[model samples]
Target: GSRSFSLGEVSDMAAVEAAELEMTRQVLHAGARQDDAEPGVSGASAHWGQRALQGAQAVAAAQRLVHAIALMTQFGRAGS
Candidate 1:
């Protein structure tokens, strides 16, 4: 089991949640755009698109989070 803590808090938690949903949509849509490169098959531009998008987004989010924690006081910081 694991626990998580708010790296601070978002005033617009709703908006953040919306963005979270939208990020998922991005991954799904990107994935759906291309064909699936199944076993012994190759031609999944969509597959790569989804992976690329997910990685990019992870970088964006993780960078911000690490930045937050690195710069925050021991108590953490807050934002909107």
Candidate 2:
């Protein structure tokens, strides 16, 4: 009357996308912010920070899109 699920066996596009989004968010949130006062540090560091933020946002958007697609594709399905 019960069941079990394992991480190794749970391989799906939605799951993968969710994991990727979470990882990106974590990385971006953990990254150091650009120091505005230092010219040399500002250039590349600022660029990297911007890029990281964009990547995190993109991953989040992609994860939402994938989740929507998965829901639509599995409409009425008992196990997804």
Candidate 3:
């Protein structure tokens, strides 16, 4: 037997979201760099080339995530 709500519903949802967003994009940037260094024209080069625009979007998302993190701390401080 097992309990669901005890473990499932009791957690920091915002923290989870922030950590996942941060970690996944960290990997994305690393992958992009790896692809760039692998080849100069066809294999990795094509995808890496387009990542310039994609990275901009990723940066925007990360900015919003960091803002959310700031707001979370601010709200806690205000409540105290």
Clash count list over all predictions: 0, 0, 0
lDDT of each: 0.76, 0.79, 0.76
Error of 3 at 78 (Å): 90
Give per-model CA RMSD: 28.4, 27.5, 24.9
Best by TM-score: 3
What's the distance in Å from true for residue 21, model 3? 1.2
How far is 76's C-alpha from truth in model 1 (Å)? 80
What residue runs in model 2 are displaced by over 4 Å at the alpha carbon?
Answer: 1-50, 77-80
**Tens digit of per-residue lDDT, candidate 3, span 1-80:** 55445554446776798899999988987774454566545444466757887888889998999999899898886765
Consecutive 10-residue window with the lowest summed lDDT within model 3: 1-10
Off by over 4 Å in 3: 1-9, 33-80
Please give the TM-score that candidate 1 achieves against the real structure.
Answer: 0.26
By lDDT, the better pick of 1 and 2 is 2
lDDT of candidate 3 vs native? 0.76
lDDT of 2 by residue, 2-77 (tens): 3676555666766988999899999998888666546543334476779899999989988999998899788855
TM-score order, best first, reads 3, 2, 1
**TM-score attained by model 3:** 0.28
